[PDB]
Amino acid sequence: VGRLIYTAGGYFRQSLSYLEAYNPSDGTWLRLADLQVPRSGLAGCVVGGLLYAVGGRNNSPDGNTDSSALDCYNPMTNQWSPCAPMSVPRNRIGVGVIDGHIYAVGGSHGCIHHNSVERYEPERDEWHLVAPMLTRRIGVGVAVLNRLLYAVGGFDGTNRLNSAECYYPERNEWRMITAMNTIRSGAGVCVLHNCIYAAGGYDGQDQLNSVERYDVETETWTFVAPMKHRRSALGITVHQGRIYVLGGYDGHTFLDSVECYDPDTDTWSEVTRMTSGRSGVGVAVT
C-alpha cells in the first residue's frame, strides 16, 4: 500500500480524460477524478507528492487542439487544479524534473517543431524559458540523471531522430551526447539504476520493441532484452526498481498491455492490462 502508478489521458478515437492508479503489489486499478480537459500525447510527472499533467492534445472543436496547459492533481483530495500555462502549446511533449522544477521539452504546435524548453517553478507557479535544445524534437523522450536533463530521439519536422543531447542546468547549455543505435520517436525514456533507458518508439517505418540504455561512464548505448510487444506513444515509469511501460500503438491496435522490466534478470513480461487500450498517455509514480 505504498506508491502507485498513475496513468492520465491517452488516446482512443479521441483524447481521453481517464486518471487511473495501478497498484503493482495487488494488481488492481483505481479510477480517480477525470482530467478537466482530455489530452493525448501529454506527459506526466511528480513533484512534492503532487501529480502534474503537461501539454498534449485536447479535443477542442475550434482547430486549436495543441495544449499549453499544466494541471495539478492532489491524491489526498482527488482534486485537479489548473496551473500557469506554458509559453507555447506543446503536443507530443517530453518532461523531466530537476530539483522540484518541471522542464517542458520540445513537442509541437501545428507545423512548429519546438527545440525550445521551459522550466516551471511550483513554488512560484511560473514558467520561464531556458536555453533551447540543439535539435527540434517532437515525440521526444526525456529523463533526468544526476541533475542533468536528457532529450532523446524525436522528429525534427523532416527526419526521425536517433540523436540525443544533455542539458546542464548550472550552465544553461545543451550538449549532444552519443546517438542511439536506433531511430526513435514517441519512445519511452526513463532513468533506472544510473542508466537512461529508451524503449519502443517509431523508427519511421515500424513500431519498435527493441530497448537500449545509455551509460554516462562509457558514453555508449547498448541493447537489452526487447519488449514483448512493439509499441510507440507508450507511457513509461519506474516502480520498486523496475521499469513499467503502459499502452501504446503497435501499428494496428491501441494496446491495453502493460509490461515490466527486471534489470537484474534482464527480462520483460506482461503483468497486467489497463482498463482499456490507449496510446499517448502520461505516467508518474507517487
Residues that bind ligand 41P (CB under 6 A): 11, 40-41, 56-57, 91-92, 138-139, 155, 185-186, 202, 232-233, 249, 251, 279-280
From the CB of 46, what's the least distance to ligand 41P, in Å?
19
List the grid coordinates of 60.
Answer: 477542442
Q: Are 36 and 28 in contact (CB under 8 A)?
A: no
From the CB of 37, what's the least distance to ligand 41P, in Å?
13
Which CB, 197 or 249, lies closer to ligand 41P? 249
Q: Are 238 and 218 in contact (CB under 8 A)?
A: no
186: region left, alpha or beta (phi > 0 left; psi from -120 to 50 alpha): left
Which CB, 92 or 239, lies closer to ligand 41P? 92
CA distances from 176 to 61, 149, 150, 201 (A): 39, 12, 9, 20
Q: Are 159 and 153 in contact (CB under 8 A)?
A: no
Which CB, 155 or 167, lies closer to ligand 41P? 155
From the CB of 196, what's the least distance to ligand 41P, in Å?
18
From the CB of 90, what's the least distance to ligand 41P, in Å?
10
Which CB, 24 or 209, lies closer to ligand 41P? 209
Which CB, 82 or 251, lies closer to ligand 41P? 251
Q: Chain-centre distance of CA 271, in angstroms?
A: 20
Q: Maximum distance among all alpha carbons in the chain?
A: 50
Which CB, 120 or 155, lies closer to ligand 41P? 155
Q: Are 247 and 230 in contact (CB under 8 A)?
A: no
Q: Compute the distance between CA of residue 162 and CA of residue 95 in angstroms, rounded to an integer.
A: 18
Residue nearest to ligand 41P (CB): 139
From the CB of 18, what's the least distance to ligand 41P, in Å?
13
From the CB of 65, what's the least distance to ligand 41P, in Å?
8
